[PDB]
């Protein structure tokens, strides 16, 4: 579940795991396909699409989806989630505004995007009716068994985590998640790369002049614009899109 910089995250620009990129109000059926940077779906391991894994800390939190809310000018209706990606039936709206409820906090994310829903037809409704003729609209699927396209999803770059840079009672003290690769030095001269377990820092003292980094590329990410490049390489991780636009007859 990637974490990026939401633009108007309740107050202002936070870093939400559900940071909204690639809003697509381009279909007709009241539907938008969205990408959160969060990867809900199965858990970390193997079970139940209808659970909920975002990033809290450096860490995931693969738990229940209980109180998702996509919304716009009005509250939307979820359609389905798969991967980083959710489909939801929305009305028109100047913006798009997404958010779940972890339980202790609202913890939402919101974004600008021009949305409309013309139905296909010479009638310019604002909303799909219960009746009328069927005719060839453009629309996204409910399903996941989907390969019609795939987007590049290679590694994450590093990320900041100054929870690492503690103090060794006079020196600034870095640690490691699980033996992950922490890329480290300070403005002063000390250890210059950092590919280590928990190091200390001989030279500098201040937490605010050091490289708290997490090269933790055991799991790839979506290639968000709000991602810092993993400078090393274009790793593999070509990964499908579920919600292909299909020729449904709305």
């Amino acid at each position, epitope marked *: 579940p990637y974490i990026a910089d939401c633009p108007n995250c309740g107050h202002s620009r936070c870093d939400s795991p559900i940071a909204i990129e690639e809003v697509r109000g381009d279909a007709h059926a009241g539907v938008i396909r969205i990408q959160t940077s969060a990867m809900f779906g199965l858990k970390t391991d193997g079970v139940d699409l209808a659970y909920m894994s975002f990033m809290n800390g450096k860490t995931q939190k693969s738990i229940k989806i209980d109180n998702l809310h996509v919304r716009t000018s009005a509250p939307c209706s979820l359609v389905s989630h798969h991967g980083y990606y959710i489909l939801a039936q929305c009305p028109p709206g100047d913006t798009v505004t997404v958010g779940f409820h972890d339980g202790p906090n609202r913890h939402t994310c919101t974004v600008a995007h021009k949305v409309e829903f013309r139905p296909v037809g010479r009638e310019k409704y604002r909303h799909p009716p219960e009746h009328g003729v069927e005719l060839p609209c453009n629309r996204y699927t409910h399903k996941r068994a989907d390969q019609g396209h795939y987007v590049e999803m290679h590694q994450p770059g590093l990320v900041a985590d100054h929870s690492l840079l503690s103090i060794h009672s006079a020196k600034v003290k870095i640690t490691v998640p699980s033996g992950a690769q922490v890329k480290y030095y300070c403005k002063c001269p000390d*250890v210059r790369e950092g590919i280590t377990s928990s190091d200390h820092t001989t030279t500098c003292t201040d937490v605010k002049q050091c490289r708290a980094y997490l090269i933790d590329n055991k799991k790839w990410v979506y290639n968000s614009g709000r991602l810092p490049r993993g400078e090393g390489d274009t790793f593999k991780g070509k990964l499908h899109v579920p919600f292909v636009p299909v020729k449904a007859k709305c």
Partner: antibody
Amino acid sequence: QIQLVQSGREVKNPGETVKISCKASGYTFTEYPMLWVKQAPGKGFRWMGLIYTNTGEPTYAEEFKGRFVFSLEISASTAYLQINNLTNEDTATYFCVRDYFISLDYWGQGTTLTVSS
Amino acid sequence: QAVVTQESALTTSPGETVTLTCRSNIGAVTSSNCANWVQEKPDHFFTGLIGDTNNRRSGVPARFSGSLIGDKAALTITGAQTEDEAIYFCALWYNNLWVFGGGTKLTVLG
């Protein structure tokens, strides 16, 4: 197991230079850098700096940046302290030390310098 | 630019429990100061006891343990012995350099 054995004690008149060796035994030199500590006659213990026995970069304590120069005969597991333009108030004992376990675990025997005409 | 302070001298008897402390002039001592305890026996004989607050060097009797008590680093000798009579120095890390305390002269009956 680990022995850091130091050179013997010198006498030097003011102005001279001294190279104090520290020959390491028992560990792999390269994974543990060296602390140089000055225990001055009265004053107690003071950190002079640390040398990365892997890259070779020294850190000096600010009190020691200048006349003091750390170096190493890597090849022979030796670290060395060189004090140039000896000042009379440098008489004291200098210890090499291994930095490990979030501190220092082994200290050497000491090399005592008596700066005196 | 930090001053480590230690008790000057402490006297105990064989079999007792004695605590030496290490205080930092800048603030409470914390685990990021990686308190080290070093012992000096006569003849300029140095050995490391504890490092990173509570890691006992290998081959240092178990009667020796380190910890943080209040806002300072402490060394406890549980069952002090006659052999423990020496000077104990604490060292604290401060992001880029080490500062040594003045040392505590400990005297043990025996």
